[PDB]
């Protein structure tokens, strides 16, 4: 088969700057009719891939003119002249010159922007869940930048690692931030044995956290 290899695997790029992604085919992909059927797609999270460029260098109608394609032989290049926030996602090259049709491995375009502190929100177990005998403490850390941020929990002032699960959204297509949820799951029994519950956010750069707390007795 034709192997398509993309460089780089991830491309951090400042908003407004230019970006360039390359795609190398392991063999020739000139179809027997003289054309080179190499396409570029952008896949946003949850969406189907959107066609950007076809036959190496032809911009598909409807596609913004900041996108362009070029290449010859076995090296093909997608360029974005001025990256916008809506341009984040995973870019794929794709060839349908030779069976089997094949995709590159994808390049994730990541927007670089200014630091942003998270908006942090803490939620005790709902009455509904406690009535069912469970106890989850939920902490949202929303719209921050950069993506690397750590969460630590404290119960009655002591650090707590048991029962913590974290999840991150993909980078936001409007403000280029990240968001994260941290969920502390305990038995209701253990939850009712303690009073203070703290969600603490630290960046890897700074030692100053952002904290949110609640006290069960209130």
């Amino acid at each position: 088969d034709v192997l398509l290899t993309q460089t780089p695997l991830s491309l951090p790029v400042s908003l407004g700057d230019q970006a360039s992604i390359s795609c190398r085919s392991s063999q020739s992909i000139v179809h027997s009719n003289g054309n080179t059927y190499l396409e570029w797609y952008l896949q946003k999270p949850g969406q189907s891939p959107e066609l950007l460029i076809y036959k190496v260098s032809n911009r598909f109608y409807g596609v913004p003119d900041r996108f362009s394609g070029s290449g010859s032989g076995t090296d093909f290049t997608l360029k974005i002249s001025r990256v916008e926030a809506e341009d984040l996602g995973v870019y794929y090259c794709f060839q349908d010159s030779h069976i089997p049709y094949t995709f590159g491995g994808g390049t994730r375009l990541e927007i670089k922007r200014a630091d942003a502190a998270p908006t942090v929100s803490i939620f005790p177990p709902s009455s509904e869940q406690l009535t069912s005998g469970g106890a989850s403490v939920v902490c949202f850390l929303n719209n921050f930048y950069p993506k690397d941020i750590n969460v630590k929990w404290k119960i009655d002032g002591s650090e707590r690692q048991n029962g913590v699960l974290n999840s991150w959204t993909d980078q936001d297509s409007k403000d280029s931030t990240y968001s994260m949820s941290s969920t502390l799951t305990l038995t209701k029994d253990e939850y009712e044995r303690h009073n203070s519950y703290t969600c603490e956010a630290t960046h890897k750069t700074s030692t100053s956290p952002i904290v949110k707390s609640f006290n069960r007795n209130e």
Binding site: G62, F103, G105, S121, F123, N142, S181, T183
Partner: protein, 210 residues
């Protein structure tokens, strides 16, 4: 306008078969080829094969020969992909894709197949209640993926963060947050709607001050 409507998600046990569908409209059905593409986490995108409804001719990626079979029914303008001898390796999102023309490219909305011996479990949905205030919805302990979370039936869409599910003790859990002006809550209702296709359950959980 050209549209391709795929069948809904499916939970299927290993060793079974499954037939997924792709209903086409808005063009002469027999004049364009339809492709299928597999999208499995950590394996990018893979082209499976195509069928030409004009003559029911097929071409397959060698990888899927003896696994996938494409068929066409002209009366209903529908293409099917059947997968046999199912394993966990077959769990994926499957796309059907019509040959491209000038007025857009034509991908279906995707079908999420989960191949698992585990039974369906509906989510338990809990309200997360306490300028811009943040409310939430905890969607706990369901199987399989996916679930569909919206707020106020989808009319509340900006300021929403719905997080990827994490697997914990063989069940998935996610949460969703929404941020709205205090001048609108609780004076106006805020509800998270959680729809789980495998169990055909939909919950509307109103968020009420504690």
């Amino acid at each position: 306008e050209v549209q391709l409507q795929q069948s809904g998600p499916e939970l299927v046990k290993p060793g079974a078969s499954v037939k997924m569908s792709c209903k086409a409209s808005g063009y002469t059905f027999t004049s364009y080829v339809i492709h299928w593409v597999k999208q499995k986490p950590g394996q990018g995108l893979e082209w499976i094969g195509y069928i030409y409804p004009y003559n029911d001719g097929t071409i397959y990626n060698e990888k899927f020969k003896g696994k996938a079979t494409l068929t066409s029914d002209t009366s209903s303008s529908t293409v099917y992909m059947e997968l046999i001898s199912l394993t966990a390796e077959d769990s994926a999102v499957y796309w059907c894709v019509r040959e491209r023309d000038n007025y857009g490219v034509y991908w279906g909305q995707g079908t999420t197949l989960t191949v698992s011996s585990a039974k369906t479990t509906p989510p338990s949905v809990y309200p997360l209640a306490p300028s811009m205030v943040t409310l939430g919805c905890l969607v706990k302990g369901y199987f399989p993926e996916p679930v569909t979370v919206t707020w106020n039936s989808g009319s509340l869409s900006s300021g929403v963060h719905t997080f990827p599910a994490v697997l914990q003790s063989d069940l998935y859990t996610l949460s969703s947050s929404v941020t709205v002006t205090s001048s609108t809550w609780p004076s106006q209702t805020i509800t998270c709607n959680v729809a789980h296709p495998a169990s055909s359950t939909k919950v509307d959980k109103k968020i009420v001050p504690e």
